[PDB]
Amino acid sequence: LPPVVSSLIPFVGSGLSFAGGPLQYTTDAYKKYGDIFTMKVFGQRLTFLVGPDAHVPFFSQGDAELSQDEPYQFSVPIFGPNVVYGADLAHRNQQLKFIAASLSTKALQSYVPLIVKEAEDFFAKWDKSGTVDIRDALAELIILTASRCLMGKEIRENLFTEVAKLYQTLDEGLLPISVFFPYLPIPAHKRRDEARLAMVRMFKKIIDERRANPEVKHNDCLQVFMDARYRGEEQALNDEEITGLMIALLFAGQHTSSVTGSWTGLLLFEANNKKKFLPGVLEEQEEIRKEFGDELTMEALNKMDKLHRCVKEALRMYPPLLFVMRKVIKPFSYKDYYVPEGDTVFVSPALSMRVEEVFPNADQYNPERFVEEDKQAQKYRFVGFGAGRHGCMGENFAYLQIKTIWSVLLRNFDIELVGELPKPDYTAMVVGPAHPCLLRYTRK
Ligand code: HEM
Ligand SMILES: CCCCCCCCCCCCO[C@@H]1O[C@H](CO)[C@@H](O[C@H]2O[C@H](CO)[C@@H](O)[C@H](O)[C@H]2O)[C@H](O)[C@H]1O
Structure with a gap:
């Protein structure tokens, strides 16, 4: 045999995020096999959990039972050495507390005037009427706003x-x-x-x-x-x-x-x-x-509340992260089933938030569904921001950013969708509306 220079068997699970959005495939498997089922790829067991009951083992268990380390290994050379998923749990947990502190209610109280000023200035530069790629525009505003709130005035204003x-x-x-x-x-x-x-x-x-x-x-x-x-x-x-x-x-x-x-x-x-x-x-x-x-x-x-529910209903129907995933450290039981050590478990917010039993007429846009849904006591029904220990710490910031954007637009412009609703673009790990995403605007 010629020389073998390397032999690698990588963790395959993170690959789901770049599989071109196999939602209908996973939906078909859910409708046939029920709320827990397994795909094998190169003999690696990928176990899916659909709907509130099946969510419990995923969101209610902790770092000792379910690991983020393998799913988030991609991030280690991006964020750098000993940062978050590149740190040991002792340091990681402390770093997540520092992030929680930077995104607390108190912190947001101080950020909101900065968010509001960036948005107002941004839209004040628009023509009297025109057509805009709303995805390109909001990506520009949201990186400007984050440079200020995360990185501070020196970097926003100079660099x-x-x-x-x-x-x-x-x-x-x-x-x-x-x-x-x-x-x-x-x-x-x-x-x-x-x-x-x-x-x-x-x-x-x-x-x-x-x-x-x-x-x-x-x-x-x-x-x-x-x-x-x-x-x-x-x-x-x-x-x-x-x-x-x-x-x-x-x-x-x-x-x-x-x-x-x-x-x-x-x-x-x-x-x-x-x-x-x-x-x-x-x-x-x-x-x-x-x-x-x-x-x-x-x-x-x-x-x-009504604008809040319009954001939440966009997130329900088109969640930007199709999957959240964990490596199973400790086997667990879910009803009649056993999930073994070494499985990768998935929750798809996309799948789970089109379950008819949870969200009637799930394929219909209805932001007022959340008047009733917000009263429901059953946990893990809405999972756009994940849930449990590693639930999104940016949720409140995200809502303030997006509600500020649409408040400024709603008060200053008449807006119409140009052509057909865009279809999702499944080419990156964050799914978004396919370009071109055109809105026509006219100042009031
Ligand atoms: C609408 C926008 C957003 C969505 C849909 C979203 C969604 C999520 C999801 C699903 C998770 C859970 C990941 C997992 O379980 O592995 C998460 C975690 C997190 N998000 Fe967000 N997020 C959003 C905006 C933001 C923003 C603006 C920030 C920061 C300013 C942020 C900071 C985080 C952090 C720090 C975590 C990590 C929690 C942990 O590992 O303990 N998010 N996000
Ligand atoms: C503290 C813990 C932090 C948790 C870390 C969570 C990580 C979240 C993963 C975000 C990954 C973002 O992935 C990013 O997706 C966007 C599109 O949405 C891509 O964006 C780029 O390509 C896409 C198409 O591919 C274009 O539509 C987009 O206009 C372009 O700028 C980036 O090329 C990709 O890198």
Whole structure:
């Protein structure tokens, strides 16, 4: 035999995210076999859990029973060394607490004026009338807004173009092959590795300058991460870790929020949906303005229930992450069944939120379904943001970002969907509406 230079058997599960959106295939298997079933690929067992009952083992178990490490291995060379899914549990859990602190109610209270100002300025630059790719526009606004709230005023105001380009290069580094072989030495991965080091060099300058002026307070996630302490350690996080936590929140928060922001508009301003649901949403904006005035405050955004439900219903019908997945560390029972050590378990928010028994007329747009649904006591029915221990920590931020966007648009423009509702684009790990995603707008 000629020389064998390497022999690899990678974890296959993360591959589902780049399988071109096999929802109808998995739906067909659900309708035949029921709420728990297994596919084998190269002898690796992939076990699916559909609907609230089957969700319980997935969302109610913890790190000792279900592991994120294998599913999120792709992220380790993106976020950097000893960051989140590249850290041991002891450090990981502490880092997730620092992120929780940066996205708390208190933190959001301070971010909201910054979100509102970026949105108002952004849409104030629009022509009197025209046609816009809402997905391209909202991706632009959402990276501007995150550069301010996550990274702080220095980077937003001086280095936006530089930091946006570094992020773009990390985004371009995540290929299908990347989830099987995160360390494969290809050009896209070399560019990724250089872009991450370049970002660390950029944050090192801001951090060093902030510590040289420790009286100067900052309303950003960077300040929370600079103040952060590991238990029984006086030394702060190093620059690589602080930078890694930023990149993690860009990956968590950018495409998810911009695709959900985009579907919110494309669905609501579709001719039939617009006739039914727009009047209520416009009425709500008037009632909000009568009670609170014109300032978009935390308090006023929190009262926009009908707009909130329009976002939630876009997320129900077109979740940006088709799968969440865990490696099974400890076997468990679900009803009559046994799920063995070594299985990969999946929940598809896409599948689970088209279950008729949970969501009647699941393929119909009906944001007012959530008046009744929000009263239901049964856990894990709506799983757009996941659930349980590793449930989305950005949920409240996401709702404030998207409701701010559509508040500013609804108050200032008449909007129509151009042509047919876009179909989902299943080419990346975040699913969004296929370009072109055109809305026609006219100032009021
Ligand atoms: C509409 C937009 C969003 C959706 C649909 C979404 C969805 C999700 C989902 C499904 C998870 C669970 C992942 C898993 O179980 O493995 C999650 C986790 C998370 N999301 Fe979001 N997310 C959104 C926006 C954001 C934003 C804006 C941020 C940050 C600003 C963010 C930060 C996170 C974090 C930190 C986690 C990790 C929780 C953990 O591992 O403990 N998300 N997100
Ligand atoms: C603290 C823990 C953090 C948890 C981390 C969670 C990670 C979340 C994974 C996000 C992965 C994003 O994946 C990203 O998807 C978007 C599209 O949506 C792609 O975006 C790019 O390609 C797509 C098509 O492929 C285009 O439509 C898009 O306009 C373009 O900019 C990126 O090329 C891809 O990298």
